[PDB]
Structure formats: C-alpha cells, structure tokens
Amino acid sequence: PLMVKVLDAVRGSPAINVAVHVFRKGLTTEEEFVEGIYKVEIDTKSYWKALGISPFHEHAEVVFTANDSGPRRYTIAALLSPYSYSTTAVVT
Amino acid sequence: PLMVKVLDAVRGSPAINVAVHVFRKGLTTEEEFVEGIYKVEIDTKSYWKALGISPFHEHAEVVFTANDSGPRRYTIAALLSPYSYSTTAVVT
Amino acid sequence: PLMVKVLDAVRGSPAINVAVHVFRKGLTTEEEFVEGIYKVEIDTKSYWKALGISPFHEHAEVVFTANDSGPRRYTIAALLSPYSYSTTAVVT
Amino acid sequence: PLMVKVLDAVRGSPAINVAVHVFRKGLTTEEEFVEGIYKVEIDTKSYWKALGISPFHEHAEVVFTANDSGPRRYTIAALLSPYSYSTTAVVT
Amino acid sequence: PLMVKVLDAVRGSPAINVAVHVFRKGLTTEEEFVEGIYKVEIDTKSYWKALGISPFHEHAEVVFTANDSGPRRYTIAALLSPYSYSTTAVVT
Amino acid sequence: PLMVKVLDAVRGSPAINVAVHVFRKGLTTEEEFVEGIYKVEIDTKSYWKALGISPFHEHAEVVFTANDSGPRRYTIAALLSPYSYSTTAVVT
C-alpha cells in the first residue's frame, strides 16, 4: 500500500510551488524521463547540435565563428521565489 | 507499506518550493531519470555537441573560433529564494 | 514498513525549499538517476562535447580558439537562500 | 521497520533548505546516482569532453588555444545561505 | 528497526541547511553514489577530459596552450553560511 | 535496533548546516560513495584528465603549455560559516 500525502491541511495564505511525482513499476536517445518540471533558461545558446551521421565527411573547409558581444541587460526580481506578505520592486 | 507525509498541517502563510518524488520498483543515451526539477540556466553556452558519427572524417580544414566579449549585465534579486514577510528591491 | 515524515506541523510563516526523495527497489551513458533538483548554472560554457565516433579521424588540420573576454556583470542578492522577515536589496 | 522523521514540529518562521533522501534496496558511464541536489555553478568551463572513439586518430595537426581574459564581475550576497530576521544588501 | 529523527521540535526562527540521507541495503565509470548535495563551483576549469579510446593515436602534432589571464572579480558575502538575526552587506 | 537522534529540541534561532548519513548493509572507477555533501571549489583547474586508452600512442610531437597569469580577485566574507546575531560586511 503506497500512500503519499503532501500539504493536506493549509490554514492562511502561503505561496507554494508543489511538484509531486509518484512512479510505481541515432545520435541522442532518451527514455522514461521527467525533465524541466520548473526549469528556467535565460540567454541560453546552442550553436551546433546533432548535425547528423557523416556530416562534413570529406574535404570540408569550414570556419566556425561565434561572436556574442552586445548591450543586453536582464533584471529579474523574484526568479522562482514564491513570497507571502512581501514587497517586490524593480526601480530603474 | 510505504507512507510518505510532507508539510501535512500548515498554519500561517510561509513561502515553500516542495519537490516530493516517490519511486517503487548513438552518442548520448539516458534512461529512467528525473532532471531539472527546479533548475536555472543563465548565460549558458554549448558550441558543438553530438556532431554525429564520422564528422570531419577525412581531410578536414576547420577553424573553430568562439568570442564571448560583451556588455551584458544580469541582476537577480531573489533567485530560487522563497521569502515571507520581507522586502525585495533592485534599484538602479 | 517504510514511513518518512517531513515538516508535518508548521505554525508561523517560514521560507522553505523541500526536496524529499524516497526510492524502494555510444560515448555517454546514464541510467536510474535524479540530477539538478535545485541546480543553478550562471555563465557556464561547453565548447566541444560528444563530437561522435571517428571525428577528425584522418589528416585533420584544426585550430581551436576560445576567447572569453568581456564586460559582463552578474549580481545575485539571494541565490538559493530562502529568508523570512528580512530585507534584500541590490542598489546600483 | 524504517522510520525517518525530519523537522516534524516547527513553531516560528525559520529559513530552511531540506534535502531528505531515503533508499531501501562508451567513454563515460553512470548508474543509480543522485547528483546536484542543491548545486551551484558560476563561470564554469569545459573545453573538450568525450570527443569520441578514435578522434584525431591519424596525422592530426591541431592547435588548442584557450584565452579567458575579461572584465567579468560576480557579486553574490547570500549564496546558498538561508537567513531569518536579517538584512542583506549589495550597494555599488 | 531503523529510526532516524532530525530537528523534530524547533521553536523560534533558525537558519538551517538539512541534508539527511538514509540507505538500507569506457574511461570513467561510477555507480551507487550521491554527489554534490550542497556543492558550489566558482571559476572552475576542465580543458581536456575523456577525449576517448585511441585519441591522437598516430603521428599527432599538437600544441596545447591555456592562458587564464583576466580582470575577473568574485565577491561572495555569505557563501554556504545560513545566518539568523544578522546583517550581511557588500559595499563597493 | 539502530536509533539516531540529531538536534531533536531546538529553542531559539541558531544557524546550522546538518549533514546526517545513516547506512545499514576503464581508467577511473568509483562505487558506493557519498562525495561533496558540503563542498566548495574556487578557481580550480584540471587540464588533462582521463585522455583515454592509447592516447598519443605513436610518434606524438606535443607541447603542453599552461599559463595562469591574471588580475583575478576573490573575497569571501563567510565561507561555510553559519553565524547567529552577528554582522558580516565586505567594504571595498
């Protein structure tokens, strides 16, 4: 008998992020997985992935150049932070 | 008999991030996994991944260049930090 | 009889990050794993990973160059730090 | 009979980071593992990993250069430090 | 009968980082492990890892150069240090 | 009968880092281990690790150069030091 009980009696007003999981039992392969339940990706780069079988196999002249040079600003006040009875502000 | 009990009686208003998991039982392979339940990726780079079987196999002239040179600013006030009855501010 | 009991009676308003896990039982391989439950990756780089079987196998002329030279600023006030009845501020 | 009891009665408002785990029982291989429950990676580099079987096998002329030279600033006020009834500030 | 009891009665508001684990029972291999429960990696470098079987096997002319020369500043006020009723500040 | 009891009655607000573990029972191999429960790595370098079986096996002309010469500053105020009713400051 598997019994899982989470946050059953709540009185008041909290801030929650519940993640309950119960399990009873050619280049990239994945199986039976739970990924990115509460994930966050900011300014994330992937230039060359899984190009394929036999890419640039013979006599390949290639110049890979990657220039990440910029005036980019990211300002997050409450990233993944539940809060109760509080004050959150970004003042520029 | 498996019994798991988490945060059953809450009185008041907290800030919570619950992650409850119960389990009863060609180049990259993964199986039976739980990844990035509460992950965060900021300014994350991946230039060449899993290019493939036999890439650049014969007579390959290649110049890999990666220049990460920029005025990028990241300011996070409460990254993954639940908070109760508090004050959070970013003042620029 | 397996019984796990976590934070059952809470009175007041705390700040919590609960992570409860119960288990009853060609180049990169992984199996049966729980990774990055509360992970954080800031300015993380991966230039060449898992290029593949037989990469640059014969007569390969390659110049790998990686220049990470930039005016990047990262300022985190509460990184993975739940807090109660407090004051958090970034003042620039 | 396995019984695990953690933080059962909490009165007041603390700041907690609970990590409870209970277990009852071609180049990189991993199995049955729990990694990075509360990990943090700041400015982390990995240039060449798991290139593959037979990489640069015959007559390979290669110049690996890695230049990490930059005006990058990282300022973290409460890294992985839950705090209660406190004041946290970054003032530039 | 295995019984583990941690922080059962808490009165007041402390700052805690609980890590409770209970267990009842081709180049890199790992199995049955718990790694990086509360790890921190700042400015961590890995140039060449697990290149593969037979890398640079025959007649390989290679120049490995690694130049880490930069104006990088890291300032952490409370790294892995839970604190209660305190004041934490970085003033530049 | 194995009974482990840690920090059962806490009155007041301390700062704690609890680590309770109970166990009842081709080049790098590891098994049955718990590593980096509260680890910290600052400016940590690894140039060549686990290159592989038969690397640079025949007629290899290689120049390994590693130049770590830079204006890098690291300032940590409370590294792995929980503190209660205290004042922590970095003033530059």
The DSSP bridge partners found for residue F9 are E9
Q: How far apart are CA F56 and CA E48, in angstroms?
A: 14
Q: How far apart are CA E79 and CA D36, in angstroms?
A: 17
C76–A contact, CB cutoff 8 A:
no
Q: How far apart are CA C72 and CA B42, in angstroms?
A: 12
CB B82 within 8 A of CB C15: yes
Q: DSSP assignment, residue D58?
A: B
The DSSP bridge partners found for residue F91 are E91
Residue with tokens 């508001």: E13
Whether F86 has a binding-site annotation, put simply, is yes
A75–C contact, CB cutoff 8 A:
no
Rg (CA), chain F: 23
CA angle E52, E58, E62 (to 5 degrees): 75
> Chains contacting E with at least 3 CB pairs below 8 Å?
C, D, F
Nearest residue to C91 via CA among C70, C75, C71: C75
- Chain A meets chain F (3+ C-beta pairs below 8 A): no
Q: How far apart are CA A87 and CA A74, in angstroms?
A: 20
Structure resolution, Å:
2.4
| Annotated domain spans of chain C | 1-92
Residue D47 φ/ψ region, left for φ over 0, alpha for ψ in the -120 to 50 degree band, beta for the rest: alpha
User: How far is the CA of F38 from the CAs of D12, D49, E19, F80, in angstroms?
Assistant: 27, 26, 9, 8
Q: How many helices (H) and strands (E) does chain D have?
A: 0, 10
Nearest residue to D90 via CA among B78, B11, F84: B78
Residues in CB range of D33: below 8 A, 6 or more apart: C32, C33, C35, E30, E31, E32, E33, E34, E35
Nearest residue to E64 via CA among C58, F67, C50: F67
Residues in CB range of A57: below 8 A, 6 or more apart: B54, B55, B56, B57, B58
CB C69 within 8 A of CB D67: yes
Rg (CA), chain C: 23
The DSSP bridge partners found for residue E15 are D15, F15
Q: Which two tokens stand for residue B1?
A: 């008999």
Out of F13, F52, F70, name the one closest to residue D69 (CB): F70
Q: How far apart are CA D75 and CA C76, in angstroms?
A: 6
Q: How far apart are CA E20 and CA D5, in angstroms?
A: 10
| B47-B51-B54-B57 Cα dihedral, nearest 10 degrees | -30
Q: Which two tokens stand for residue F56?
A: 């640079």
CB E27 within 8 A of CB F26: yes
Q: Which two tokens stand for residue D18?
A: 């609970």
Nearest residue to A81 via CA among A44, A38, A41: A38
Query: Chains A, B: CB contacts under 8 A, how many?
Result: 351
Residues in CB range of D50: below 8 A, 6 or more apart: C27, C28, C49, C50, C51, D27, D28, E49, E50, E51, E52
Can you tell me whether residue C1 is helix, strand or coil? coil
Query: Chains B, C: CB contacts under 8 A, how many?
Result: 351
CB B63 within 8 A of CB D64: no
- Chain D meets chain B (3+ C-beta pairs below 8 A): yes
Rounded to the nearest angstrom, the minimum Cα separation between C58 and chain E is: 10
Residue with tokens 């396995």: D2
> Chains contacting B with at least 3 CB pairs below 8 Å?
A, C, D
Q: Judge residue A28's burial from the number of C-beta atoms within 10 Å of its C-beta, 0-12 exposed, 13-18 middle, 19 or more buried.
A: middle
Q: How far apart are CA E78 and CA D78, in angstroms?
A: 5
Neighbours of F69 (CB within 10 A): 10
Out of B12, B14, B69, name the one closest to residue D70 (CB): B69
Neighbours of A65 (CB within 10 A): 11
Q: How far apart are CA B54 and CA A57, in angstroms?
A: 6
What distance separates the 2 farthest-apart alpha carbons in chain B? 70
Question: Which of chain B's residues have a Cβ under 8 Å away from the Cβ of A64?
Answer: 47-48, 62-66
- HEC letters along E44-92: EEEEEECCCCCCCCECCEEEEEEEECCCCEEEEEEECCCEECCEEEEEC
DSSP states of C4-68: EEES-EEES--B---EEEEEE---EEEES-EE-SS-EEEEEEEEEE---SSTT-BS-EEEEEEEE
Which phi and psi (to 5°) does residue F91 adopt?
A: -120, 110
Q: How far apart are CA D90 and CA E92, in angstroms?
A: 8
Residue with tokens 């603390």: D14
Q: How far apart are CA E17 and CA D86, in angstroms?
A: 17
Out of E13, E52, E70, name the one closest to residue C84 (CB): E13
Q: How far apart are CA D88 and CA E16, in angstroms?
A: 17
Pairing mode, strands C34-35 and B40-49: unpaired
User: How far is the CA of D87 from the CAs of A23, B80, E85, E90, in angstroms?
Assistant: 42, 18, 8, 11
Interface of D with E in 9-38 (CB under 8 A): 9-38
Sign of CA dihedral F81, F82, F88, F92: positive
User: How far is the CA of C11 from the CAs of C20, E10, F6, in angstroms?
Assistant: 20, 10, 21
* Side chain identity at residue F87, one-letter code: T
CB C53 within 8 A of CB B54: yes
Question: Which of chain C's residues have a Cβ under 8 Å away from the Cβ of B43?
Answer: 42-44, 72, 74
CB B32 within 8 A of CB A29: no
Which phi and psi (to 5°) does residue B81 adopt?
A: -130, 85
* Side chain identity at residue F8, one-letter code: D
Residues in CB range of D78: below 8 A, 6 or more apart: B81, C77, C78, C79, C81, C83, C88, D88, E77, E78, E88
CA angle F79, F82, F84 (to 5 degrees): 135
Give chain B's length: 92
Neighbours of A63 (CB within 10 A): 10
Beta strands in A12-86 (DSSP E): 19-24, 28-31, 34-35, 40-49, 61-68, 73-79, 83-84
Helix (H) or strand (E) segment spanning residue B10 = strand B9-11
Q: How many CA atoms lie within 13 A of E3 on its CB side?
A: 6
Q: How far apart are CA D19 and CA C17, in angstroms?
A: 8
CB C13 within 8 A of CB E13: no
Q: DSSP assignment, residue E9?
A: E
Nearest residue to C78 via CA among F87, E72, A44, A80: A80
User: How far is the CA of F11 from the CAs of C86, D83, E4, E11, E13, in angstroms?
Assistant: 20, 17, 20, 5, 9
Q: Which of C88, C91, C92 to mutate to test the interface with A (most CBs of A within 10 A)?
A: C88
Q: How far apart are CA F74 and CA F40, in angstroms?
A: 13
Neighbours of B90 (CB within 10 A): 24
Q: DSSP assignment, residue F36?
A: -
Residue in C closest to D27 by C-alpha: C27
Backbone breaks in chain E after residues (C–N over 2.5 Å): 25
C69–A contact, CB cutoff 8 A:
no
- Helical segments of A4-92, H only: none
CA angle F45, F49, F55 (to 5 degrees): 145
Rounded to the nearest angstrom, the minimum Cα separation between E34 and chain D is: 5
Out of F1, F59, F73, name the one closest to residue E1 (CB): F1
Question: Which of chain D's residues have a Cβ under 8 Å away from the Cβ of E47?
Answer: 47-48, 64, 66
Do the chains contact at D89 and C84, CB–CB below 8 Å?
no
